[PDB]
Design a protein around this ligand. Structure first.
Ligand SMILES: Nc1ncnc2c1ncn2[C@@H]1O[C@H](COP(=O)(O)OP(=O)(O)O)[C@@H](O)[C@H]1O
Ligand SMILES: Nc1ncnc2c1ncn2[C@@H]1O[C@H](COP(=O)(O)OP(=O)(O)O)[C@@H](O)[C@H]1O
Ligand SMILES: Nc1ncnc2c1ncn2[C@@H]1O[C@H](COP(=O)(O)OP(=O)(O)O)[C@@H](O)[C@H]1O
Ligand SMILES: [Zn+2]
Ligand SMILES: [Zn+2]
Lengths: 716, 474, 279
C-alpha cells in the first residue's frame, strides 16, 4: 500500500518525490502535497509529492541526498503518511559543511541558498541534508535548527541564520553510531534474546498490560572481551529508538570522592524522568567488584548507591538496565537476584559462518584485490573474536602499504593519486597478518560452537547408539520423559586408552542436539586447583546454564580426581536443575583412579568404554585425515590400514604427518635444485617403517580387565 | 533533552560563555623539551586555577569560570553519557510525595525522602564580581538623606550588568540610579510594609524596564556619628564583630530567591540570582566607605524552607525546630583549624553567618576614561519618597526647576536637565503625556544622538500642554 | 523505613545522623514501627569490617537501641538473610532478642503463592496449578514469581508470529487472544533455576510410615526415642527422666536412612534441616 518502492529521482531537488499515478490514487495523495516519508532506522523526512506516470505502480523516485538521509538504498520500501499540520519555519539556523565551502568567496548564503528557498516552500527537518548547485559549485548543508521544531516549511518570510563556524565532515562518519543489525553478524541467537527482552517491553507495552505481568528489568550480558557486547547494546538501543543513556565504569570511578554516587543518582533520575529509557552500564565489574576484592569505603558506597537505585526503580517506569561484564563471578553477588540483573546473556566465539560475516562487514571499504577468498580466511581463522578479525584486517592493510612503500617518498608530503590507485590488499597480506596475529579468547574457558556429525568418527556403532539414546532423546522428546516420569540422565564418563577420539564423540553429541560446547582441559583444572586462575567451577557452570542447552566437557579429570575442587564440582552437579539441558561429559585414562563419589547416581554415573579403532575404522580415519591432501592416483590405503593393527587415531595422524613431511622435503629439494604435487606410496612405506604404537600391551590388558569387571558387575 | 537545554538569558552570559579564558604561559626555565611541545608548566592555565587567584589576591572564582570547570570535569563529547546537567540549585524541602509505601511526611517517612544532614561550607564562586557606581552623587545624595534627618535609610538600586576584565570571566553590576521605597525609618532601624512596597516597586520596575534599567540590588546605611567635631563614624562592622547581622542576611537571601538568574545549564533553568547587597558603615577611620556582599547558594535555599531566624548575638543566626510542614535536619558547618585540617562542628543552637556570605569589591569608574552614563543627574529634582525632609515633588518644584530653561531653549541645558531619573518618573506619574510621547521622551533623555528626538518631543502637543500648565501653576 | 544500603550510601558522617533522626522521630510520633531492612549492611560481623565508619555506625545503632528501651511504644524490626552475619552484640537483652526463621514453603504454601501471583493472568482453562505446585520443590516465592513471568513471556513469544513489530500498535483481537497454557508453565519450569537449596534452609516434610517398607522394629525404636517426649512430656517430667538428644543410623548405603529421618520429623510435626556430605 504505502510501502513505495525506492528509485533514483531524475531531479536533484531535496524536497521533491515523484510517485506513480496509481499509488497517488490509492493513498488519495496529490501533486504538490507535503508528506512524511519514513525509511529505515526510524529516519523520517518531509517531501513534496509530484505525480509522474513513468514510474511503475507502487514505485517512487527520490534523489541521492534523501536516500542518504533516510539511510536506505535503491529498491527499498518507504512508508508515506499525510503531513497536513506542518507550519512555516519561523527561523531556520543552518551552517554549511567545511569541506564543501573551501575556496568560496563572498557571502555563501546569498550566492547559494537565497534563490533556493525563496518561492520554494521546501519543508525542512532537523538533521537533514540539502545540496545547492550554484554557478560552478555544489555545496551540501545541514538543518541544524528549525523553529517551529522539529520541522517546518521554509517560506519567503522565514529568517535563515547562516552565521556560524564551518562544520567538520568527519564527525558524521568517524562517529558512526546509530548502527543497526546490519553491522552485527554471527550472533543471531543472543541478538534475538536481547531484542525479545528489550524491544517488547518498550515498543509494545500493551502486551504485558493485557497479559498482566511486570516485565523483567535487568539484563546482564557477559563473555570474552572484544566480542562486541558494547556494539550489540548500542545497536539494540539505536534500533529501539529509546533514550539511550550509556554509563561507563571507569568514567564513573575516576571522579572525586562523593561525586561518583552523585553521577549515578543523576543518571538514574534522568533515565526515569524521560521514560522510556535504556540505561547501559558498561563494564559494571569496575563499579561493583566481588566482595573479596577492594574493601575500601569509597569502593563500598558506590555499590550501595547502585543497589539502592536498582531497588528504587521497581515501578511503572519503562526503564531497562543492561550491564556488561567479562565473567559472571566478577560482579558482586548481591546484583544477581530477583528485581535486579536476573536475566543473563552469554556471548560466545563465532563459528566459521560468523567469522565470514564479520570479515565481510569489516572488509567492505577496503580496496581489496580480485584474489580474495574470504571463505578461506574464515576457515583458517579459529577462535578469532570480532576484535581479532578487525586487527587482522588492519594489519593486512598495513602490510600492503609496507609492500607498496617502494614508490613512496616519506620526505615529500605529496603523493600521486596514481600510486594511491594501485593500492590493493592481497591474499598474501592476509596470510602475513594471520601469521602475526595474537588471539587471546581461548586462554580462558569460553562457550563455542561445533559442527561435527556422525561421519568423522569411525566405527563405534554401539557406542553411538548408546549416546543417541542417552542424549538425543531427552532434548528432542522431553514430552515422553514427562509422560513416563523418568528424569533425564545428567552426564556420562568416557574411559579408554588415549587417542581413541573421545573429544570427537563429545563434539558429535553436542552437534546432534545443537548445543553449545564448553571445553575444560587439564591445565585449566590444575590452575583452578592452585587458585591462580581467573575462572572458577561456579563460573563455568553459570555460563553453561546461561548458554543452555550446553555440553560441558572435562578432560583428563583424573589429575584432579586423585579435594576442594572435586567438592565444588560435586556441589555444582547437585545444584543444577534436572530439566535444564546441561550435560557433563568427563574423560579420563585411569578410571579406577577417579574418586568414587563422582560415580554415584545423580552424577557422572554412566561409564562408557572407548575401544581402539578397528581395521575399517583405521581406513576411515586415514581417508578422513587425507581429504584435503593430494594423493597419488590409484593409491589404496587398505594395505596401510591392515599393517597398522592396534594403532590409535593419534598414531595414524603421526604417520600421515611424517609422510607429508617427506613429500614436502622432496619437493623443496627438487625446487631448490631447479614436480611431486602428491605423495607417493614410498613416503607412506617409510612413515610406516618409522611407526610406533602409543599403548603398551599391559595397559590394553588392564583396560580390558577393567571392562570385564564392569560387565560382570552388571551381568546375571 | 538529548543535549544542552534551550533557554534565553542575558547577553553578558552568552558572550562570556563564548570565550574560553585560557591564560597563556611562556617557556618556564624548568622545561626540558624543544620549542614545540609542552610538558606540564608551559600549558595554558585554566581560568579557574586556584593558585593564580590566591596569588593575584582574588578570593572567588568568577562563576562563569566555575561553569567552565564543571563542564570540563565531565560531559565527554560524542559519547559517554547523554548530558547530565552540571548545575543544580540546593533544595531542602522534604518531598511530600515519595511513597515507597509510606504516607506523606506528617505521618510517615522512609529513608529515601528524609532530608540528609546539611554541611555548610564557605562558597567559592561569586556570581557578580564588581559593583560599580557611575557617579558618586548617587550614593552621596543617599547619605545626604541621613545627614539631614539623622535616621537610617534603605533603597533599591537600578542598573545593568557587563563584563569585567580584571577577573577571569568576571562580571560587574553598573548601578545608574537609586530608588527609595516608602519606609518608616527610625534611629536604630527601619520598617516598611512589604506588600505596599512590592506593589509600588512592580510599576516602578515596569517603568525602569521601559527605560532599559533593571533592579540589581538593595543598599542601606548603618551609620552612627561619633562625638568628634568633624565627620567621624564608629566602625561597628569589621573582622572583630559581624559584617552583616542575621536579619540582613535573611533579607538578602529572600530577595535573591525572588530574582532568579535564568541560566541554560540547570534542570530548572535558574541559579544563584545576581543581586548584590551593599552596606554603608564606615571603615576603621572616620570615612563612610561602602561595602558589598552576597549570601551563598545554601543560605539562599536554606531560608526558602524557613530553618533560620535572627539571634540576639549579631553574628550568629538561630535555628528553628521541627514541626509538621517543616523538617530541619542536623546542620554542620565545616571550617579549617589552624593546623590545616577540616573540622565539622554541630551547630544547632547558633552558628556564625560568615559561612553564608561571599564578598564583592565596590568601586567607581576612572575619572578620566569614557563616560557612558545614562543619566547626568542626581543633583536636582527631589527624590521620590523624601516626605520626611523638606523634599516634596510637586508642580511648583517643577516650575522652579525646569521652567526657565524650557521656556527659552538651550537644548544642551534642556537635555542635561531632562535626563534625571526621578524627574522622568514623576512626569510619567503626571500622565499628561501619551504612551508613545513618553517613549520618545525617554529615548531622548536616556540616549545619545538625541537631537531629532528632543525636537520631536518639543514639537508635540503634549509637551506644549505640560509647559502651559507649568506656566499656569505658580 | 530504614534501608541498609541506602543509609550506607551516604557520605561519611551523614550515615549516623540519619539513624539518630529516625529513632528520634519514631519516639516523638509514637506509637511507631521501625523496619531496618538489610541490617547486615549497616552492622556486619565484627571481623568482616574494620573501617572506622563501620564501627561508628554500629556503635550509634547500639546506643540508640539501648536508649530506646522505655515506656515509649516503639518496636524495632530487622531483617537479614544470614543469622550469623549480624554483629553478636546486637542479639542481647534489650536488643534484637526475639528471632524468627523463614523457611522455604511446602506444597500447599507453593500452591497458595501460585494462586496469589496467578490471579490476573489470562490463564487458559487447561491449567493444573496443583501439578505445578507438586513439581516445584525448593522453589521460593520469588522463584515462583519469576516462573510465572517467564511462562507469560513464553506465551507472548509464541503468539508473536501474528504480531508485526513494525507497527507500534497491534490488532485488538490478537491482543485479546492472549492465554497461558500448561506447556508454557512446563517450559518456564525448564528454564527456571532455584537458588535456595545452595545453602542450608528449613523445609517441612510429609512422609509417613507408608513410603518405607519393613523396618518395623526400627520404626518402633524411633517412635519411642522421639515421639513420646514431644507428644507427652508430662509423663517424662513426672518420672524426671530427660529425653535423649540424638540418634545415629548406620548400615549399607541406599537403605533409606533419609526417608526414616523425614518420617520421624513428620511424626512429631517438626521442621527438617539437612546437611549433605559436600556441605
Ligand atoms: N559483529 C561483531 N561481533 C563482534 N565484534 C564486532 C562485530 N562487528 C564489529 N566488531 C568489533 O569488535 C569490537 C567489539 O568491541 P567490544 O568488545 O564491544 O568492546 P567493549 O570492551 O567495550 O565491550 C570492536 O572493535 C568492533 O568494531
Ligand atoms: N574416529 C577416530 N578415532 C580416533 N581418533 C580420531 C578419529 N578421528 C579423528 N581422530 C584423531 O584423534 C585425535 C584425538 O586427540 P585427543 O582428543 O587429544 O585424544 P583423545 O581423543 O584420546 O582424547 C584428534 O587429533 C583427531 O585428529
Ligand atoms: N524402604 C526403603 N528402603 C530402602 N530404600 C528406599 C525405601 N523406600 C524408598 N527407598 C529409596 O531410597 C532412596 C533414598 O536413598 P538413601 O537411603 O537416602 O541413600 P543413603 O543411604 O545414601 O542416604 C530413594 O530414591 C527411594 O526411592
Ligand atoms: Zn615545558
Ligand atoms: Zn519516602
Amino acid at each position: 500500500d504505502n510501502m513505495l518502492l525506492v528509485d533514483d529521482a531524475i531531479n536533484d531537488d531535496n524536497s521533491v518525490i515523484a510517485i506513480n499515478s496509481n499509488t497517488m490514487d490509492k493513498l488519495e495523495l496529490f501533486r504538490g502535497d507535503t508528506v512524511l516519508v519514513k525509511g529505515k532506522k526510524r529516519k523520517d523526512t518531509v517531501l513534496i509529492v509530484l505525480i509522474d506516470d513513468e514510474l511503475e505502480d507502487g514505485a517512487c523516485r527520490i534523489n541521492r541526498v534523501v536516500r542518504n538521509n533516510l539511510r536506505i538504498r535503491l529498491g527499498d520500501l518507504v512508508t508515506i503518511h499525510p503531513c497536513p499540520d506542518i507550519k512555516y519555519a519561523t527561523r531556520i539556523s543552518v551552517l554549511p559543511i567545511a569541506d564543501t565551502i573551501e575556496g568560496i568567496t563572498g557571502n555563501l548564503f546569498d550566492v547559494f541558498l537565497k534563490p533556493y528557498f525563496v518561492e520554494a516552500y521546501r519543508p525542512v527537518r532537523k538533521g537533514d541534508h540539502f545540496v545547492v548547485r550554484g554557478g560552478m559549485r555544489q555545496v551540501e548543508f545541514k538543518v541544524v535548527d528549525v523553529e517551529p521544531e522539529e520541522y517546518a516549511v521554509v517560506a519567503q518570510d522565514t529568517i535563515i541564520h547562516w552565521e556560524g563556524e564551518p562544520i567538520n565532515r568527519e564527525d558524521e562518519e568517524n562517529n558512526m553510531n546509530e548502527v543497526g543489525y546490519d553491522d552485527i553478524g554471527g550472533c543471531r541467537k543472543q541478538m534475538a534474546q536481547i531484542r525479545e527482552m528489550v524491544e517488547l517491553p518498550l515498543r509494545h507495552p500493551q502486551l504485558f498490560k493485557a497479559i498482566g505481568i511486570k516485565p523483567p528489568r535487568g539484563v546482564l550480558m557477559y563473555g570474552p572481551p572484544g566480542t562486541g557486547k558494547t556494539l550489540m547494546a548500542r545497536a539494540v538501543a539505536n534500533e529501539t529508538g529509546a533514550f539511550f543513556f550509556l554509563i561507563n565504569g571507569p568514567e564513573v570511578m575516576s571522579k572525586m570522592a562523593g561525586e561518583s554516587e552523585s553521577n549515578l543518582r543523576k543518571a538514574f533520575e534522568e533515565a526515569e524522568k524521560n521514560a522510556p529509557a535504556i540505561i547501559f552500564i558498561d563494564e559494571i565489574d569496575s563499579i561493583a567488584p566481588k566482595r573479596d576484592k577492594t574493601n575500601g569505603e569509597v569502593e563500598r558506597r558506590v555499590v550501595s548507591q547502585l543497589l539502592t537505585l536498582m531497588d528504587g526503580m521497581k515501578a511503572r517506569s519503562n526503564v531497562v538496565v543492561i550491564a556488561a561484564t567479562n565473567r559472571p563471578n566478577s560482579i558482586d553477588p548481591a546484583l544477581r537476584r530477583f528485581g535486579r540483573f536476573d536475566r543473563e546473556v552469554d556471548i560466545g566465539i563465532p563459528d566459521a559462518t560468523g567469522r565470514l560475516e564479520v570479515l565481510r562487514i569489516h572488509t567492505k571499504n577496503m580496496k581489496l584485490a580480485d584474489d580474495v577468498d574470504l571463505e578461506a580466511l574464515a576457515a583458517e581463522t579459529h577462535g578469532y573474536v570480532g576484535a581479532d578479525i578487525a586487527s587482522l584486517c588492519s594489519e593486512a592493510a598495513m602490510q600492503q602499504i609496507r609492500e607498496k612503500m617502494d614508490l613512496i617518498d616519506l620526505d615529500e608530503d605529496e603523493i600521486d593519486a596514481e600510486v594511491l590507485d594501485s593500492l590493493g590488499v592481497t591474499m598474501d597480506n592476509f596470510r602475513f597478518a594471520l601469521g602475526n596475529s595474537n588471539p587471546s579468547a581461548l586462554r580462558e574457558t569460553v562457550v563455542e560452537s561445533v559442527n561435527v556429525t556422525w561421519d568423522d568418527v569411525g566405527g563405534l556403532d554401539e557406542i553411538k547408539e548408546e549416546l543417541k539414546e542417552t542424549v538425543e532423546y531427552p532434548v528432542l522428546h522431553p514430552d515422553q520423559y514427562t509422560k513416563f516420569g523418568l528424569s533425564p540422565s545428567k552426564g556420562v564418563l568416557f574411559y579408554g586408552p588415549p587417542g581413541t577420539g573421545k573429544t570427537l564423540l563429545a563434539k558429535a553429541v553436542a552437534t546432534e542436539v545443537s548445543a553449545n560446547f564448553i571445553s575444560v582441559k587439564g591445565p585449566e583444572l590444575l590452575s583452578m586447583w592452585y587458585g591462580e586462575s581467573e575462572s572458577n567451577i561456579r563460573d563455568i557452570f553459570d555460563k553453561a546454564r546461561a548458554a543452555a542447552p550446553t555440553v560441558v566437557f572435562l578432560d583428563e579429570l583424573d589429575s584432579i580426581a586423585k579435594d576442594r575442587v572435586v567438592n565444588q564440582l560435586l556441589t555444582e552437579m547437585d545444584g543444577m536443575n534436572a530439566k535444564k539441558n546441561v550435560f557433563v561429559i568427563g574423560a579420563t585414562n585411569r578410571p579406577d583412579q577417579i574418586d568414587p563419589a563422582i560415580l554415584r547416581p545423580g552424577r557422572l554415573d554412566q561409564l562408557i568404554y572407548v575401544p581402539l579403532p578397528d581395521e575399517n575404522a583405521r581406513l576411515s580415519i586415514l581417508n578422513a585425515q587425507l581429504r584435503k591432501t593430494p594423493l597419488e592416483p590409484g593409491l589404496e590405503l587398505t594395505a596401510i590400514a591392515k599393517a597398522t593393527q592396534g594403532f590409535s587415531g593419534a598414531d595414524l595422524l603421526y604417520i600421515v604427518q611424517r609422510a607429508a613431511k617427506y613429500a614436502i622435503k622432496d619437493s623443496i629439494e627438487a625446487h631448490r635444485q631447479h614436480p611431486v604435487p602428491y605423495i607417493t606410496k614410498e613416503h607412506f612405506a617409510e612413515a610406516m617403517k618409522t611407526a610406533k604404537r602409543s599403548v603398551s600391551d599391559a595397559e590394553l590388558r588392564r583396560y580390558e580387565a577393567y571392562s570385564q569387571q564392569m560387565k560382570a558387575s552388571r551381568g546375571q | 533533552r538529548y543535549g544542552p537545554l534551550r533557554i534565553k538569558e542575558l547577553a553578558v552570559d552568552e558572550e562570556l560563555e563564548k570565550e574560553d579564558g585560557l591564560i597563556p604561559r611562556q617557556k618556564s626555565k624548568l622545561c626540558k623539551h624543544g620549542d614545540r611541545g609542552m610538558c606540564e608548566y608551559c600549558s595554558p592555565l585554566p581560568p579557574w586555577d586556584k593558585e593564580y587567584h590566591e596569588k593575584n589576591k582574588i578570593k572567588h572564582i568568577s562563576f562563569h569560570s566555575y561553569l567552565k570547570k564543571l563542564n570540563e570535569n565531565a560531559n565527554k563529547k560524542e559519547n559517554g553519557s547523554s548530558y547530565i546537567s552540571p548545575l543544580s540549585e540546593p533544595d531542602f524541602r522534604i518531598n511530600k510525595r515519595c511513597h515507597n509505601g509510606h504516607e506523606p511526611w506528617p505521618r510517615g517517612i522512609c529513608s529515601k525522602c528524609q532530608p540528609s544532614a546539611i554541611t555548610l561550607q564557605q562558597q567559592e564562586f561569586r556570581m557578580v564580581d564588581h559593583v560599580e557606581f557611575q557617579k558618586s552623587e548617587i550614593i552621596n545624595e543617599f547619605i545626604q538623606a541621613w545627614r539631614y534627618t539623622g535616621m537610617q535609610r534603605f533603597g533599591y538600586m537600578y542598573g545593568s550588568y557587563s563584563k569585567y576584565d580584571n577577573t577571569p570571566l568576571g562580571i560587574k553590576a553598573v548601578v545608574e540610579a537609586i530608588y527609595e521605597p516608602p519606609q518608616h525609618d527610625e534611629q536604630d532601624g527601619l520598617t516598611m510594609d512589604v506588600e505596599q512596597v512590592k506593589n509600588e516597586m512592580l510599576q516602578i520596575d515596569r517603568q525602569a524596564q521601559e527605560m532599559g534599567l533593571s533592579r540589581i540590588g538593595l543598599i542601606f546605611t548603618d551609620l552612627s556619628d561619633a562625638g568628634a567635631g568633624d565627620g567621624s563614624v564608629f566602625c561597628k562592622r569589621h573582622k572583630d564583630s559581624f559584617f552583616l547581622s542575621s536579619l540582613e542576611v535573611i533579607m538578602a537571601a529572600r530577595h535573591q530567591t525572588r530574582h532568579p538568574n535564568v541560566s541554560k545549564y540547570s534542570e530548572q533553568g535558574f541559579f544563584s540570582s545576581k543581586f548584590v547587597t551593599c552596606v554603608i558603615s564606615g571603615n576603621l577611620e572616620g570615612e563612610i566607605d561602602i561595602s558589598s556582599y552576597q549570601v551563598s547558594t545554601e543560605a539562599e535555599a536554606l531560608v526558602t524552607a524557613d530553618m533560620i531566624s535572627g539571634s540576639t548575638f549579631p553574628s550568629m543566626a538561630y535555628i528553628n525546630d521541627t514541626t509538621d510542614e517543616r523538617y530541619v535536619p542536623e546542620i554542620f558547618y565545616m571550617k579549617s583549624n589552624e593546623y590545616g585540617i577540616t573540622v565539622k562542628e554541630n551547630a544547632k543552637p547558633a552558628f556564625p553567618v560568615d559561612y553564608l556570605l561571599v564578598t564583592l569589591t565596590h568601586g567607581f569608574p576612572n575619572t578620566d576614561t569614557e563616560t557612558n552614563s545614562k543619566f547626568v543627574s542626581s543633583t536636582g529634582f527631589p527624590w521620590s519618597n523624601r516626605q520626611a525632609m523638606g523634599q516634596s515633588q510637586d508642580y511648583q518644584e517643577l516650575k522652579k526647576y525646569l521652567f526657565n530653561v524650557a521656556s527659552s531653549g538651550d537644548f544642551n541645558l534642556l537635555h542635561e536637565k531632562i535626563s534625571n531619573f526621578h524627574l522622568l518618573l514623576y512626569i510619567n506619574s503626571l500622565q499628561i503625556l501619551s504612551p508613545d510621547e513618553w517613549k520618545l521622551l525617554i529615548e531622548s533623555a536616556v540616549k545619545n544622538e538625541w537631537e531629532e528626538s528632543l525636537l520631536k518631543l518639543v514639537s508635540s502637543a503634549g509637551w506644549q500642554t505640560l509647559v502651559m500648565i507649568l506656566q499656569e501653576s505658580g
